[PDB]
Design a binder for this molecule. Structure first.
Ligand code: CA
Ligand code: CA
Lengths: 369, 82, 411, 411, 369
């Protein structure tokens, strides 16, 4: 793995949106978004390196920008200008390299943008992030007091390795501003002090390295000739929006921060039900202000489990036999209920009560006998 | 009985939830819950300032130029305004 | 001295028994099950998670012949196109008009954060059964564990208990079973090397970090028709997530007989079914001669009002005249009336109060106190409350459940 | 001079009648009712609204123990938990470990804003009746509002009227009624003292400003386990809010016979049902003897077109001759025909036109011009318009609703 | 009942949700949220007195709040830093003492926050807020012209009163920074120029009053001994996050402003129905762009009333007898319609078609005769 950060550079990407809501070339193009945390956090990967200075001296409040204009270099701006949003503004929890953490309200799109400055840009990608809870008993805010259950949250500390991302040597980067159409001939020009590597085919293939305005052998249209810089060697990410180099082998491996780490988290407990006991049965006077789960199952040779997200203040009639019945309610521990044989009547005294007592229990054995 | 794996283990073996660890508050008898050995530290808390730059003693910020020393060294009653 | 017995497999509740040998004082014997987990023999074959499609930077050649090779990456796919014109920030990337070619590329990999929600596929068979016994006899306690097969005895320091084969046999696990995040499901996954796009097991791997990933997500590239450069692709919906959406009720809340399924060794601990017979060999040291046990004369049993319920409803009392101080085991020789205490202290002419839990309307059961046998008959009513949180002690048995009054009415 | 009759109880629809004596010409006597309320006696017992639990700050005693004694405040639930270490912004609130306890308590009191949202529970019975009716006799108008029992009279300017008991008696209210925000429901609320959580009447109180109220909402306190200090509690859903959600239709839009219902005295006004008998005496000052009353002879009938409906559909013309000019009342003795006009100006040999309404296909009804009777019949056609906004002035009767043609056909 | 605010003081609550999405100790804790209005008005009660300066001299643009510093005194801040929001920002309508009124669109949580730079907190509780209309014909905004009914709306004037609040003695408040652990024993260090009292069971129960640092006897751990101050006398509310005093009696009261009052109130009128007349029936031709209630009933002995919310352009068929029915569409006044006999066929028909007219009327009573 590699951790030195002075020999890699940001890059431009084809953002599906922009400030003017058009297919756009922006330096804040984003590749992936992950929302596999039980807290609402989001890991966003952008195309502009965060938390590092121009030379990569690891400054907290600076980030690379990769300016628009020709003779492209890497400049920086203050980190306070960055601001991400989903449906409203949302907080930022960390930043390192390409990746920056987040925590945002549920919505339908993820936006990262630069607020002020000379250039303002944005990037939106369709991704359905919706509120998620932990365990059962759907809630909206974590309660002050409740049962502790095992969660899975991102680690906001930057020095936590989560994965493996690759880079490659940069590819050719052509420019239109390096060609001149003045008369029936083709002129090229490099920037002040730079040595471009011009090469084009009209009549035959040719190349070369020049420093000033250089003539062509002879050839009409300059649209068909290209030129690019060769003084670049900084690594770039394996993005689907770059020209591949001739070799394209892995050069250095760097980390994806904010490893998913197990932890504990509180969850609400429901209101304890009130139980009414009737012969070979049970009724529950349940109540819950938010969707809560209630699961039952028998203890015999057949289970026939039932699960239903109840939301109001209802009353459910369950049937419990001699074998038994267990039921859970919200996050509470399972509780078991066993039914005995207690039917109206009497097994003594007179036959007219003996038959009544023996009819409710085993209503077919007494009939045949 | 056997202490739960979900709870923290003190030097005294007292079992407390993991949330109470590393919060600047002694939740356990021997104080190992906030000791520097069990929790990595560099900079001190917002309400406490390092004293002496050798012992790394942290004291509340209100304990400055009060007329009484509050450190193992003598750098507590100086560099304070009138 | 061995003593064959049959003990119901209901954890928590005891089973009183009396062992007697000629010329020796009777000894109490109780057998209690405190833990019973059945562990199937598992065999992982692959694991899966949500695949993360990666698309490397497309390579373009300015009007030269291009063709890719075949690699071992998961679901590799090449598509070469002719007559393109990529447009980057500095436009006109290629110098050659309407003859340059570009090739696409796409292969799937495990997600960077799917190390925490990987689904494990298992195949299980031949479910064993291990039980932790607890037996006491004559003031000494014994804690031991043993299997259920009829050969291997789970030996204590002094004991030798051979648990016979269990009559009933079942396994809550089916032939194939998947695992994820500690929840044990019941599925029938596709076998290794035969995937189905959009179903479970979309992407397969022997290990989490293994390089032999095989997947099939029927990706298909498209010929670009936009001014700038970008490789378009269409992908089938992720299969593991689609399974997760309608996963269904896990086996933790569906397995019968009340088993609660653990995940780390794939157990099914603490559930009740069937009858497990045992053969216990009591060491000779525990016994004592009949000349030391107290002798009792004129034992009479009087029954207070009872209720045949799960809890200890029935009351009891005895009258006797012994000759010397001592402790004499008590036990009833009926299969539908379980007592409460085994050892009791016997004075010269005292009275002992007992408790029991019948399952018959009438209490025609023989009580054997220190060898002397007495019978006492009575009559008592059904229980009032009809919901308890305690499991029953004895069975209906369909014989004593009919009252004596009904019997002499029919006959 | 008393006269007995039965006026149908339909407000807004008058009915016409006369009185005959010795040597005295008949005078018009029509009875109409403008308003009629039906006020039953009420008995308020409690008023309820949504609660607002007031949980006082918990009490902690350092290095000690305490007990809590019950009070009389509504649903006072108290508990004590031992071994707590309270924390707040300044930590270490107690100089004791696992020896200092805390006191948790909670109660219920009226909401600070439900002084307008309160619901009052009533219990009505013995629904009486009073009616205000208009009497016109001898071209003189009077207004009276008497009761309905045959005892209490109504007197104003020598006008005594007696109202007998109604043929049919009912009330639109059930035994138990409940009022909120000026509209009456019809619900069966629990008696004063038997509250059930989550239903109507969760809170009872004699009045909104009473000191001692009684209620139960199964307030149950959990065990505090958080680092700082805060009392936990769970409660049943407020019953009054649930009833408001599931109230159903109010009695304003469910009462039969169209009794629109007010709420200040809980009345029920302006609806029609049954028949109310009336006895009335008339002073002789409005009576004219036959000497000055013109005598009319040679009465005749002819009608242009008759059409039976609610409004005055048929048209009737009269031809006559008399000796003196004056006023002569005209009336129809048949109960299926009424006359819009009351008095007419009679001349020597004039001819007047009259408007009549009838509910029978045949207009076979007699009239009495100053006592001179004659037959009068014709055939009437059904109306084309079958929807109107005027109640029928007469009711259907047998042996009249059957047409003469069909009557002959079936005979 | 008192109105002077020089005898009271704010207190520190325990808001379940601060800005950083965690349980916290906050000075802007809110207790209740009453939503029994009819224009969306809300009476939020917080743990900070508004409309008063530090000494409580009734200043419009100042409010009090306790300080986080260990020498806890009541501090000051400008009033325009207080904002209310549920889903969009709420617009404040008043403030007096603890309470303040607001109005803003429905959401699922109510938040108040200080948006300053020095101290910035944002409490939040879970409250179900749904828009409420008055009468029938559900509407969004009050229409310009319509009938006037009885609404119930809070009045913005702060001089009203509907309620009865209480205050009690401020309980003990210990600070962990009043103890020291120098070498082996504890040092109780009072603040500068103030008096604190220490009660402890160091070896045996003991107490004392001092204003300067002293040395305890028999102490070995800082935790064992705790010292608190005695300069707290102003009355405080009995919130469930405080510690009650030794007596805890009611020692003063204050009003709950913004009482509920009746007020004339507009409500829209639905489109007038188009009626078509058919024999022994009615065919209303309704229309409505928003949920409108139509209710009918009979005039006979049996009401068979019907009420149904309609939302489209539909038609309903009703049956009207001789006694007639009434239908109340939308907000309009009741209208009564009586039906007569218009069965086809002449009751004096020369052919034998007398039966058909006598068949529609009295369908059963004509078959037997
Ligand atoms: Ca701690
Ligand atoms: Ca100092």
């Amino acid at each position: 793995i590699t951790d030195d950060f002075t020999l890699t550079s940001p890059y431009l990407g084809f953002c599906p949106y922009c400030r003017h809501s058009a297919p756009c070339f922006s330096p804040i193009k984003i590749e992936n978004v992950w929302d596999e945390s039980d807290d609402g956090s989001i890991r966003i990967q952008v195309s502009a390196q965060f938390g590092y200075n121009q030379a990569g001296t690891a400054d907290v409040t600076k980030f690379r920008y990769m300016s628009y204009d020709h003779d492209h270099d890497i400049k920086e701006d203050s980190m306070e200008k960055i601001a991400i949003s989903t449906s409203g503004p949302c907080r930022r929890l960390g930043h390192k390299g390409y990746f920056l953490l987040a925590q945002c309200p549920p919505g339908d799109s993820v936006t990262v943008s630069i607020t002020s400055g000379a250039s303002e840009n944005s990037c939106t990608v369709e991704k359905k992030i919706r509120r998620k809870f932990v365990g059962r008993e759907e809630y909206l805010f974590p309660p002050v007091q409740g049962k502790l259950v095992k969660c899975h949250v991102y680690d906001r500390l930057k020095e936590t390795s989560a994965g493996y991302i690759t880079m490659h040597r940069p590819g050719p980067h052509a420019y239109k501003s390096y060609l001149k159409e003045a008369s029936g001939e083709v002129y090229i020009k490099p920037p002040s002090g730079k040595n471009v590597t011009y090469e084009c085919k009209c009549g035959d293939y040719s190349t070369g390295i020049v420093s000033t305005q250089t003539k062509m052998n002879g050839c009409t249209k300059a649209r068909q000739c290209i030129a690019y810089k060769l003084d670049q060697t900084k690594w770039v990410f394996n993005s689907p929006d770059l020209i591949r180099h001739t070799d394209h082998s892995v050069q250095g491996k760097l980390h994806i921060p904010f490893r998913l780490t197990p932890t504990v988290c509180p969850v609400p407990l429901a209101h304890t039900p009130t139980v009414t006991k009737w012969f070979k049965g049970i009724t529950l006077h349940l109540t819950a202000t938010r969707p809560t789960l209630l699961t039952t199952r028998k203890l015999g040779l057949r289970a026939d489990a039932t699960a239903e997200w109840i939301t109001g203040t209802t009353s459910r009639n369950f049937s419990v036999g001699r074998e038994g019945l267990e039921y859970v309610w919200g996050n509470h521990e399972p509780v078991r209920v066993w039914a005995q044989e207690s039917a109206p009547g009497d097994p003594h005294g007179w036959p007219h009560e003996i038959i009544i007592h023996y009819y409710h229990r085993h209503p077919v054995y007494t009939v045949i006998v | 009985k056997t202490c739960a794996e979900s709870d923290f283990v003190c030097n005294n073996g007292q079992c407390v939830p993991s949330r109470w660890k590393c919060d600047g508050d002694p939740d356990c008898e021997d104080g190992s819950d906030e000791s520097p050995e069990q929790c990595h530290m560099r900079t001190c808390r917002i309400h406490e300032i390092s004293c002496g730059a050798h012992s790394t003693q942290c004291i509340p910020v209100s304990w400055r130029c009060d007329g009484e020393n509050d450190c193992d060294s003598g750098e507590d009653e100086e560099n304070c305004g009138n | 001295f061995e003593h064959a017995t049959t003990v119901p497999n209901v954890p928590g509740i005891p089973y009183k028994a009396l062992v007697e040998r000629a010329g020796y004082a009777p000894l109490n014997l109780e057998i209690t099950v405190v833990s019973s987990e059945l562990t199937p023999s598992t065999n992982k074959e692959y694991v899966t998670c949500k695949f993360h499609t990666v698309i490397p930077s497309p390579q373009v050649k300015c009007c030269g012949s291009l063709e890719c090779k075949a690699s071992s990456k998961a679901d590799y796919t090449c598509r070469v196109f002719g007559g393109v014109y990529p447009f980057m920030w500095g436009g006109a990337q290629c110098f050659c008009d309407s003859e340059n070619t570009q090739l696409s590329e796409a292969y799937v990999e495990f997600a960077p954060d799917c190390t925490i929600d990987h689904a494990v596929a298992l195949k299980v068979h031949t479910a064993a059964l291990k039980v932790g016994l607890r037996i006491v006899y004559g003031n000494t306690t014994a804690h031991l564990d043993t299997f259920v097969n009829g050969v291997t005895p789970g030996s204590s320091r002094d004991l030798k208990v051979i648990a016979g084969p269990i009559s009933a046999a079942f396994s809550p696990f089916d032939h194939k079973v998947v695992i994820r995040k500690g929840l044990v499901y019941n599925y029938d996954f596709p076998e290794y090397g035969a995937m189905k796009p959009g179903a479970f097991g979309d992407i397969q791997a022997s290990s989490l970090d293994a390089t032999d990933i095989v997947a099939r997500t029927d990706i298909r590239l498209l010929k670009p028709s936009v001014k700038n450069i970008h490789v378009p692709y269409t992908q089938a919906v992720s299969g593991y997530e689609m399974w997760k959406n309608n996963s269904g009720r896990p086996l933790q809340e569906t397995a019968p007989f009340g088993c609660k399924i653990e995940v780390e060794p794939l157990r099914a601990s603490n559930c009740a079914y069937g009858h497990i017979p045992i053969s216990i060999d009591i060491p000779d040291a525990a016994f004592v001669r009949s000349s030391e046990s107290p002798t009792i004369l004129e034992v009479s049993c009087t029954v207070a009002d009872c209720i045949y319920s799960a809890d200890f409803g029935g009351s009891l009392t005895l009258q006797y005249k012994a000759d010397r101080e001592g402790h004499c085991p008590v036990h009833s020789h009926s299969t539908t009336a379980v007592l409460k205490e085994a050892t009791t202290h016997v004075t010269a002419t005292g009275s002992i109060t007992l408790h029991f839990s019948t399952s018959s309307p009438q209490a025609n059961f023989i009580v054997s106190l220190c060898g002397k046998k007495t019978t006492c008959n009575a009559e008592c009513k059904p229980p009032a409350d009809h919901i308890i949180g305690e499991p029953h002690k004895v069975d209906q048995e369909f014989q004593a459940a009919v009252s004596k009054t009904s019997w002499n009415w029919l006959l």
